[PDB]
Design a protein around this nucleic acid. Structure first.
Ligand SMILES: [Mg+2]
Ligand SMILES: [Mg+2]
Ligand SMILES: [Mg+2]
Lengths: 258, 262, 263, 256
RNA sequence: UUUUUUUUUUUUUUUUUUUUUUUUUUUUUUUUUUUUUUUUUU
């Protein structure tokens, strides 16, 4: 009754992800990419309606498409992949070490033309953590950061630990479970390390357990430095305190009314 | 009449109105082509979200069709059906060929299926739900692993219960989200069993003795033999434990740094 | 779009316009019992129809109701809101099922003047009462309806008791967890605030005006079979029987793993 | 297969400081007050389309739905529109405004005063015991926290009444105690720089006695009851009653 | 393994109270249905 169907095609699912950040390492203009990352919230909402074309250097661009699980075309990417590509462009000039997976260690990033991202460009996700502009981690705090695990595994894992521990400081909704917070990263770890055969401790030793620690304390140092939940909670305690101070003058006013 | 009211007929809700046409798969035994419905079951997840936006129409054979509609509940004609019952109808179109017997509730016994010549399903068609359980193409149970499989309890009871047992036991292996409690995994089957066995007036053991408990177990081992010993949900669980263990061993350096910081 | 609307400057000064003066006693003898029972049997469907149009509900051979959504005040007796409509027709069945009603002037329950000994049809089923384990023929069967709180005027202890049942057994009644406890009793308290004038009277005073013994009597009547038979009980017993099935099947998977012969 | 071009525009600290002092002499008092009487009405209209409101024959005020910053000084958000208009009436009812440079109250500088017509009704002030004619009648408006710039002790005191008398004023339980004060704490954080200065220093600068005089003025005629107080009192007596009947129900099951 | 999910410094935005009402509104609709969930260990 009063329903228009659509005629679904008879197509069977028959049998038959090469994404690597190393194909986009020298395609980014730093201040262009940082500006796009500074508007990630507005960009994700624009994506919900139409797909987006983002210029990331005066000769290169990306096509951000929703629900894109595969593409032979390199610069057609999902939102998380696009932010990760653009973040890596900035982190090549802020982080001095990157991970070589066949050498199983951190090797120095050789950046001949090393530049400083414009301090004026603000990352509001990073401010929520208490990080200030100029911090080398500043532009790692982006949507889709988990893809950066390919280059910065200790740093990306550390940011994930901070999101797990301080979900309330970062205004993560209590709706989300701890599994959803870490799921994306575990998927990237499982691909790199083969977690079906490997141990987690084997991965935490392959990357620097102390490296994770140093990155963790860098990203965690200034959490709770200024908190609107603690700022509001002191006001309520100070307000209810002043209400109590005002009671004898309120009853003096009502005994005067009678 | 400013309030332009519409008359409403005085029709009382009685169980004679509720049970006018209860659903049964026996009306749909010859409506589906094996390789056509498996192509629709192979794309069940896509169908479900495409169903959300607008309701759907699915050709199952040369002239017979099925219209899928969300939140349908009752309906006065046979080929207009909900998502779960549509997947159940198509599933039974392949299992008539892959399963050698079906249950007869008149006789309290499984009976051999009369399936003329049996057309073996194309092993090119891949059911991803069965692949999560380790099943491969050509397995007879392959196309039983569909949404709304519980409706197949009427034809293949012991096999549908064994699958539900497999989903409760291996819920983390099958990435069933911890949001759903154990009772949620089995709720629909219990409803299917309630209708057929009237569990209000029958025990659980009586049901599992009417159907074959020897049949259930041997379907349980067929469905759980190749279930993987890893999953993303189990990897996520192991990660949360390891991550909190790292967070704990990092707290001294953290607090020592903040007292030294401005 | 992209340009504003000039709003006119006029204030808000006005009167209470309390014109409702709604009492169920205006509709006592206007209802055919089986006609009204049948409209109540389709309450959910009629509310859905009400979202699209105003409704015309014939309640007897000589009377009808006009159901209108968002009906604040109406001067005409026939034009009522949905909650008022179900309450009006529920009272028509309850006059024949319940033997006593409250008289607020005498401050006690008095006998209902049912001259005609009419029973509501047994086959007409109230799904809302079915969710409570009440079977057809129960004298309370037709108080379990949308807008039941209006019946506090006639059956105060029984309407309060059903509200208590909705409070304690909210899970068995499939009431959403997302709705306040206060939201479930909010409208009954509006009724109680009108009849008992709760601004200048206590809840304990009101609970002594109607019978606390009478609220308890109706409570055990309405809550006797709430948990009698549950999905939560059935689905739970299934789990443990399913889990002993599994524990008995584990020697089976193991034997099929390490043994080639039939076991 | 279709994209839209996103232009490179970074979020910077650079991108108009809001001061009510820019709107002190643009409001007729009986017309700015009539807009505040139909504030709930003006509010839902703002989701449909942006609204243009007249403060007087010579000046306009256009309100839009989600303004985080505006180059224009006459397009504002709702809470600022109400505050700009309420301020127009309180310059004639309040006899003192705050000067943050001199760190204390000074006269409101209104040579010729007006008395608002007493028929314009503020239903929000009517939920409390305020009757028309009270000098605080038109401060009880949506967006009052912005008036902390001019009347900080009175605006804080109103916040105190909302905190303690939230049930009396039907503030839903879904609104946190923090949510009631979250907006005012933000206005104070801008003016007082709360990371550096404390609440006690703010309270001493505005006057804890000035707060007290506005408090007893606003909390004087709060009604003893509300729907929310009744519902909350009913739930308790209702949960008392269930317990009192639990023996009787168990006895009934044992009998049959 | 992708997809997907969530966080957006500060001010803002937003949120809430509507002449202490009554109404309106809201929620439950037997059993079954609906709903829900897993998607080739990715
Ligand atoms: Mg924030
Ligand atoms: Mg039900
Ligand atoms: Mg009102």
């Amino acid at each position: 009754s009063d329903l228009k169907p659509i005629d679904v095609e008879v197509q069977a699912f028959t049998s038959a992800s090469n994404f690597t950040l190393h194909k986009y390492r020298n395609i980014c203009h730093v201040d262009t990419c940082a500006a796009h990352l500074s508007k990630s919230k507005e960009n994700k909402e624009k994506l919900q309606a139409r797909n987006l074309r983002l210029i990331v250097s005066s000769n290169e661009f990306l096509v951000v498409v929703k629900e894109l699980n595969d593409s032979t075309v390199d610069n057609v990417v999902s939102f998380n992949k696009a932010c990760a590509i653009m973040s890596a462009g900035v982190l090549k000039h802020t982080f001095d070490e990157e991970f070589d997976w066949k050498l199983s260690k951190y090797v120095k990033t050789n950046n001949t033309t090393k530049v400083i991202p414009d301090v004026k460009i603000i990352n509001r996700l990073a401010g929520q953590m208490g990080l200030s502009a100029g911090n080398p981690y500043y532009w790692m705090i982006v949507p889709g950061y988990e893809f950066l695990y390919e280059l910065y595994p200790a740093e990306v894992l550390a940011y994930t630990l901070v999101r797990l521990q301080y979900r309330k400081n970062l205004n993560i909704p209590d709706s989300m479970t701890d599994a959803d917070i870490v799921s994306s990263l575990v998927m990237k770890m499982n691909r790199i390390h083969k977690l079906e055969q490997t141990s987690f401790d084997e991965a935490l030793n392959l990357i620097g357990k102390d490296n994770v620690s140093e990155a963790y304390v860098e990203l965690a140092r200034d959490i709770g430095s200024t908190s609107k939940t603690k700022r509001n909670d002191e006001a309520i305690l100070k307000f209810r305190e002043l209400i109590a101070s005002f009671l004898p003058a309120l009853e003096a006013d009502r005994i005067a009314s009678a």
